[PDB]
Design a protein around this ligand. Structure first.
Ligand SMILES: CC(=O)N[C@@H]1[C@@H](O)[C@H](O)[C@@H](CO)O[C@H]1O
Ligand SMILES: CC(=O)N[C@@H]1[C@@H](O)[C@H](O)[C@@H](CO)O[C@H]1O
Ligand SMILES: CC(=O)N[C@@H]1[C@@H](O)[C@H](O)[C@@H](CO)O[C@H]1O
Ligand SMILES: CC(=O)N[C@@H]1[C@@H](O)[C@H](O)[C@@H](CO)O[C@H]1O
Ligand SMILES: *[C@@H]1O[C@H](CO)[C@@H](O)[C@H](O)[C@H]1NC(C)=O
Ligand SMILES: *[C@@H]1O[C@H](CO)[C@@H](O)[C@H](O)[C@H]1NC(C)=O
Ligand SMILES: *[C@@H]1O[C@H](CO)[C@@H](O)[C@H](O)[C@H]1NC(C)=O
Lengths: 119, 404, 181
């Protein structure tokens, strides 16, 4: 059996005579998040596009793969180390590596009225 | 001209481009230690392509920031939604969606669009740093600042203003007096509403982003399909070579496959560099167009549309940006008799802000883009010289507004 | 420089260790490999140098345009010669580049006011020539757009077009005629 990429996708067993699909084993990229050698020595490891139930220190499942070694907070700060899909890493408590969603700015509402100007 | 037609056009420019990261060691060999040893004596060829593609990805992340991240604060619109009679409901986003994108956006993200086969050979597509929700929030903040402020929020703090006099200032910026807006406000609002309602039927062009997507998919499809080439070797798969020959006699076919796949990857890297140079030029043009048309009014001809430019509105698109250029197109022309100067009491008179026209019997001053005749008066005329030097100068009475 | 110490499938990396040890007509299959590898390295170097030269020619053209516009004049293009309302730019020479010192105008310290599009006086509307219509609570003034300077309502900075039945939001106020006798 062959797919559109002209490689082996399926096979037939010679004894039992049934078809068995062939799937490649899991693989991805390893990115190391470092706050700085002169600052500290503890790092974080980001796996690129790999589910967290395959990798053999807080586990986080993100759209940019599985992140190991960073703690999610529910606040929002500006981006320091961009990870991907709206998640940034930093170094605060300067004790541990934290992860968060980036903040695009403040929250401002211009006071529109029918008769109002500011000069 | 005696009348105008407010027209909303549509311009599409690509901004971003699909990031790819290629593991050059596994693309060529995959699991062969002998092929990995044979690749070691080729220098730093497998590192320069990785560095180049990393630069491509960082540049593609940088291209979005200059276009969309031009606001210090995320702006909001008060929920009354009455901007002088102008309808922005199709343009402003709705709260009844998880992504909070407008209709006009939702017609664009649906049009722009082999599964997992490229994953096995070592080709990974990195996600963008900014998701679609944050780009939509940036576009909504820019658009709300444009509605509530004008050009003031791009040069510092955001100063509040009514929309019906922001439109009067943008009318004054193209040479038309501001009484035209205050006396044809409902006509201009209805023309804008019809012109923005026709956009959905106009778009439902967008082939530039589709061409970008198709090129970036076809390059990866060719890179996958080039693995079947033998390049003079007896096989295209390394496991068939390694299970048949001793490494005394198997260092020729693997070498041929290595020189085939190295030149298959290097040309892909160079064409990606050239294509991202074009994408970076398009992103620079889009950032300049956003800064000059959205955060202000531009006097450059045919830069922010076709006509006398009033304002523009950004709309987010997949790997691009869409501008809605609002312009001033005149219509319903007439014919008049004109003169360069008026001779009265032996001295020439020239208009300080208008033209000299006649309908056949009487002479008046109008503007240059709109027909509004008025009585000849010393207030809109200045005196320079006598009626001897100018040619084509006609005689007419000039009224001074001082009776006693 | 570092690519000269590669093998490219040969048995050595320098020519003198092959031309003095290996056979004369059996070293032609490895000298060719070294020639092919070094030619490919030099061709790739020239290829990336051309693209970098184009990407720096674009920035040189951009720098020439802003030296023509911001330094040799005043530009009305938004965010081209700084961030704000542009006043000047001063060139400074730099290694392999140029540094511009963009002098811009940034306002501050705003106050809120009540606004009207026109003034209905004596049954006819009045519009400002180059100003606004603001009020601080009781009386109406004409200031500039970018600087608060309240001035007395006068015929000399207003023009009349039609009556006050077409404009919406128009308020009623007096207009001073600067003619006492
Ligand atoms: C009217 C209101 O609720 N808030 C306003 C705010 O919009 C404005 O920016 C500020 C300037 O002094 O004054 C206050
Ligand atoms: C043709 C069009 O689209 N709009 C108007 C039309 O409704 C109006 O009757 C005419 C006279 O002012 O000016 C124009
Ligand atoms: C006293 C006077 O203004 N006479 C005018 C003369 O200057 C002008 O050249 C001529 C043209 O038709 O019309 C008459
Ligand atoms: C004599 C006079 O000006 N009376 C005005 C009238 O014109 C205007 O319509 C009304 C509402 O503003 O206020 C009063
Ligand atoms: C794979 O990731 C998804 C996240 O979308 C989630 O279902 C889970 O973590 C993984 N799937 C399974 C079946 O474990
Ligand atoms: C402005 O006036 C209109 C009158 O039709 C009204 O509907 C609208 O609510 C007013 N705006 C605000 C912010 O109250
Ligand atoms: C256009 O305006 C009308 C009247 O105010 C109202 O239906 C709504 O605000 C808009 N309709 C649209 C966008 O379909």
């Amino acid at each position: 059996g062959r797919d559109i990429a002209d490689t082996t996708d399926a096979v037939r067993d010679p004894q039992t005579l049934e078809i068995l699909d062939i799937t490649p084993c899991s693989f991805g990229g390893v990115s190391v998040i470092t706050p700085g050698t002169n600052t500290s020595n503890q790092v974080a490891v980001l796996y690129q596009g790999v589910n967290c139930t395959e990798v053999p220190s807080n586990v986080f499942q993100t759209r940019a793969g599985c992140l190991i070694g960073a703690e999610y907070v529910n606040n929002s700060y500006e981006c320091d180390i961009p990870i991907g899909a709206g998640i940034c890493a930093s170094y605060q408590t300067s004790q541990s590596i934290i992860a968060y969603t980036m903040s695009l700015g403040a929250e401002n509402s211009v006071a529109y009225s029918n008769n109002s100007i500011a000069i | 001209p005696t009348n105008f037609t407010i027209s909303v056009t549509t311009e599409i420019l690509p901004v971003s481009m699909t990031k790819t990261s290629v593991d050059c060691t596994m693309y060529i060999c995959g699991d062969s230690t002998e092929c990995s040893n044979l690749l070691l004596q080729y220098g730093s060829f497998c590192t320069q392509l990785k560095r180049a593609l990393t630069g491509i990805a960082v540049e593609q992340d940088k291209n979005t920031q200059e276009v969309f991240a031009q606001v210090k604060q995320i702006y909001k619109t008060p929920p009354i939604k009455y901007f002088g009679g102008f309808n922005f409901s199709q343009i402003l986003p709705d709260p009844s969606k998880p992504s909070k994108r407008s209709f006009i956006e939702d017609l664009l993200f649906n049009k722009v669009t082999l599964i997992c086969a490229q994953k096995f050979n070592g080709l990974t597509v990195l996600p963008p740093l900014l998701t679609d929700e944050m780009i939509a929030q940036y576009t909504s903040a820019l658009l709300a600042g444009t509605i509530t402020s004008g050009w003031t929020f791009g040069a510092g703090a955001a100063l509040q203003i009514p929309f019906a006099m922001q439109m009067a200032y943008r009318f004054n910026g193209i040479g038309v007096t501001q009484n035209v807006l205050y006396e044809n406000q409902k006509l201009i609002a209805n023309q804008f509403n019809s012109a923005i309602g026709k956009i959905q039927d106009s778009l439902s062009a967008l082939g530039k982003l589709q061409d970008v997507v198709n090129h970036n998919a076809q390059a990866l499809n060719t890179l996958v399909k080039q693995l079947s080439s033998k390049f003079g070797a007896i096989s295209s798969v390394l496991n068939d070579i390694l299970s048949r020959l001793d490494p005394p006699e198997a260092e020729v076919q693997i070498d041929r496959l290595i020189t085939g796949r190295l030149q298959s990857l290097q040309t892909y890297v160079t064409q990606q560099l050239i294509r991202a140079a074009e994408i970076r030029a398009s992103a620079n043009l889009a950032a300049t167009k956003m800064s000059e048309c959205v955060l202000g009014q531009s006097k450059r001809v045919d830069f922010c549309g076709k006509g006398y430019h009033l304002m523009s509105f950004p709309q987010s698109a997949p790997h691009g940006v869409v501008f809605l250029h609002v312009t001033y197109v005149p219509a319903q022309e007439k014919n008049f008799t004109t003169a360069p100067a008026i001779c009265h009491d032996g001295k020439a008179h020239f208009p300080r802000e208008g033209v000299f026209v006649s309908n056949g019997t009487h002479w008046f001053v109008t503007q240059r883009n709109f027909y509004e005749p008025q009585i000849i008066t010393t207030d809109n005329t200045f005196v320079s010289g006598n009626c001897d030097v100018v040619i084509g100068i006609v005689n007419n009475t000039v009224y001074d507004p001082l009776q006693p």
